Amino acid sequence: MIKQRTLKNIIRATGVGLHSGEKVYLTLKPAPVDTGIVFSRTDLDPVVEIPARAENVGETTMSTTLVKGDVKVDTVEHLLSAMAGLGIDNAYVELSASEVPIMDGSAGPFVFLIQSAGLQEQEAAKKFIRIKREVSVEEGDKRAVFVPFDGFKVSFEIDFDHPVFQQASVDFSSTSFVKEVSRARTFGFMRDIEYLRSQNLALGGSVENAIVVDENRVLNEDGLRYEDEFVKHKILDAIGDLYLLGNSLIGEFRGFKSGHALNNQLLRTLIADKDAWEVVTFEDARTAPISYMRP
Numbered sequence: 104m105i106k107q108r109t110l111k112n113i114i115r116a117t118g119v120g121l122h123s124g125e126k127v128y129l130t131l132k133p134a135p136v137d138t139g140i141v142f143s144r145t146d147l148d149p150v151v152e153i154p155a156r157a158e159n160v161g162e163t164t165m166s167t168t169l170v171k172g173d174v175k176v177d178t179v180e181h182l183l184s185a186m187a188g189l190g191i192d193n194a195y196v197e198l199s200a201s202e203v204p205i206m207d208g209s210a211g212p213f214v215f216l217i218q219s220a221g222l223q224e225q226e227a228a229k230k231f232i233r234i235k236r237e238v239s240v241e242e243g244d245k246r247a248v249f250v251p252f253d254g255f256k257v258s259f260e261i262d263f264d265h266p267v268f269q270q271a272s273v274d275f276s277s278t279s280f281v282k283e284v285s286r287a288r289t290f291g292f293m294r295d296i297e298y299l300r301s302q303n304l305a306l307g308g309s310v311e312n313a314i315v316v317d318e319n320r321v322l323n324e325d326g327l328r329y330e331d332e333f334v335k336h337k338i339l340d341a342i343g344d345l346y347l348l349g350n351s352l353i354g355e356f357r358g359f360k361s362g363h364a365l366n367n368q369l370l371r372t373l374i375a376d377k378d379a380w381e382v383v384t385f386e387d388a389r390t391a392p393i394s395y396m397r398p
């Protein structure tokens with residue numbers, strides 16, 4: 104059967120929050136079956152724990168923020184993307200501050216650390232949420248859509264009014280999340296330093312953790328990791344936001360200029376429409392529509 108997975112070993116990492124600019128220490132730990140992904144602020148006394156679920160998303164401005172009362176865990180999406188890509192069902196994520204570290208701006212450092220720790224299969228069937236009806240949310244010209252699909256696939260399209268320009272579609276049962284998506288970096292326009300550092304955001308942002316773009320070009324000296332890196336990163340963001348569902352998806356997501364707000368809203372509409380989805384397990388991995396890497 105397709106079995107639940109956790110980490111084989113604990114792993115640690117350190118870095119800076121993109122938005123807050125704070126040094127943060129990160130600890131990923133194994134967790135028992137049906138725990139899901141749980142974030143833990145271990146700098147507070149008592150320790151405050153926020154399950155990574157759609158219901159705990161409190162802010163969606165330029166990142167996906169988990170919130171429980173007055174306590175937040177900011178920028179969960181890239182880490183959650185890495186967990187989903189390697190099929191981690193259960194894990195404690197400890198943090199010494201209010202934000203996941205940005206690392207290099209992509210999921211690469213996370214997938215690397217996870218696979219270094221190794222994966223551990225658990226004796227419980229993995230639960231999947233299967234999309235059985237189209238579910239669509241729109242707001243003005245942006246749209247986010249679930250469509251039934253025998254597998255897992257993400258299509259995205261962005262329309263930035265900028266000289267450097269986009270669309271991509273990836274089927275994750277036939278192409279590698281790691282090779283083709285995980286290295287795609289966070290990005291920001293120099294245009295938006297008015298906006299960002301008037302809202303006191305992106306305090307930790309630099310060329311070390313983001314593609315910086317002026318009116319005409321990428322300012323990073325070594326340029327781009329992929330020709331379509333921007334749209335690839337949006338796909339990475341979506342995978343992260345969709346994992347707040349609490350179970351892995353069988354279906355297709357289509358994004359049209361969507362982002363954190365509209366992705367979360369899709370999940371909330373999905374959850375609410377119980378005719379559009381079902382929980383399923385696979386007693387024989389050989390007949391299942393998706394597959395994962397050997398542990």
Ligand SMILES: C[C@H](O)c1nccn1Cc1cc(C#Cc2ccc(CCCO)cc2)on1
Binds near residue numbers: 309
């Ligand atoms: C964090 C979220 O998941 C995300 N992924 C891609 C973009 N975004 C949104 C975003 C994007 C950003 C950003 C940014 C920025 C701007 C300027 C600089 C350097 C300027 C001179 O050294 C560095 C970084 O902040 N939030």
Ligand SMILES: [Zn+2]
Binds near residue numbers: 180181336340
């Ligand atoms: Zn991102």
